[PDB]
Symmetry: C3
Subunit: 104 residues, 3 copies
């Protein structure tokens, strides 16, 4: 019935640093603006600089958030990166102590 | 019977950098001192600097660890952050090769 | 039948920075070269510098990847770190939009 089967998901993307601006805009547009960003490096297949974007979601289908990130991060060249979806079992809002999907 | 249903959990917190000291103390007090820290930035709702604290736990209830972090990280102002709990299926101690919940 | 029960896994290692070179080589040798690296700090049991290595895998058994990392990261001294395995529910290749285990 509910998005994400009434649960919580972590959308974790590794993308090109120069695409972060467009990804932020895409996340806002899809209604899930919250995100955490980490400077990382990697290789697919000397490491290349990338950025990790993490969005924990509940109200918004994880697949919709992943699509929004992927569309904005895309260039068509090797090195564009990947998005992964992981399960999250609980969430706690530090300011209030509120827990569960409504804390996300 | 066992804490965390006899399994392993990742407690992942995104908090204010200035609260890391108190969070370290709280983690020690609750008996789960091990942690990994990452410099990150984010927004909720220009990114703001935050810190990610990760604690993989087995012997200590994940909820107790989350509460300890949340209490120490709290200020009452927007920007205090969030704690998320994710499942961990296995753990390996590099020094010994020991595996399972006892490796955590 | 398939590796990882036909699913996807995240292998997340926290190791000594000076072992990253040997870990990269070990990952290539085991046939799972892709990785993402993060500068982190931590304590087990003043934080010490460590490196986080993340490998999302499907075709290669997660346990085999963990063993490869652990062998290369090992020194025998306290501080060698840990490897954790987490479930991943989906993967998307940004360049192509391809999804599922074949996107990993
Ligand atoms: N299977 C994987 N596991 C971990 N990180 C990955 C994986 N695939 C891609 N990455 C990250 O995403 C970046 C771009 O991937 P790619 O477009 O496949 O070359 C890499 O440099 C890594 O940082
Ligand atoms: N749903 C979320 N997903 C990812 N990161 C989040 C989320 N909510 C909060 N954060 C992180 O936590 C910080 C503080 O959150 P807040 O107190 O909600 O403004 C943000 O700047 C982000 O780094
Ligand atoms: N249970 C844990 N949760 C989170 N990080 C850990 C844990 N155990 C070890 N670490 C990380 O791994 C590093 C080395 O661990 P150790 O060899 O146990 O002292 C620490 O400094 C932390 O960064």
């Amino acid at each position: 019935d509910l998005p994400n089967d009434g649960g919580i998901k972590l959308v974790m993307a590794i993308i090109r640093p120069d695409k972060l601006a467009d990804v932020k805009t895409a996340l806002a547009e899809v209604g899930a603006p919250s995100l955490t960003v980490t400077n990382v490096s990697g290789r697919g297949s000397d490491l290349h600089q990338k950025v990790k974007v993490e969005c924990v979601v509940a109200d918004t289908p994880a697949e919709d958030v992943a699509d929004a990130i992927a569309d904005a991060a895309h260039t068509g060249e090797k090195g564009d990166g990947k998005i992964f979806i992981l399960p999250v079992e609980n969430a706690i809002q530090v300011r209030t102590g509120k827990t569960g999907r409504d804390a996300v």
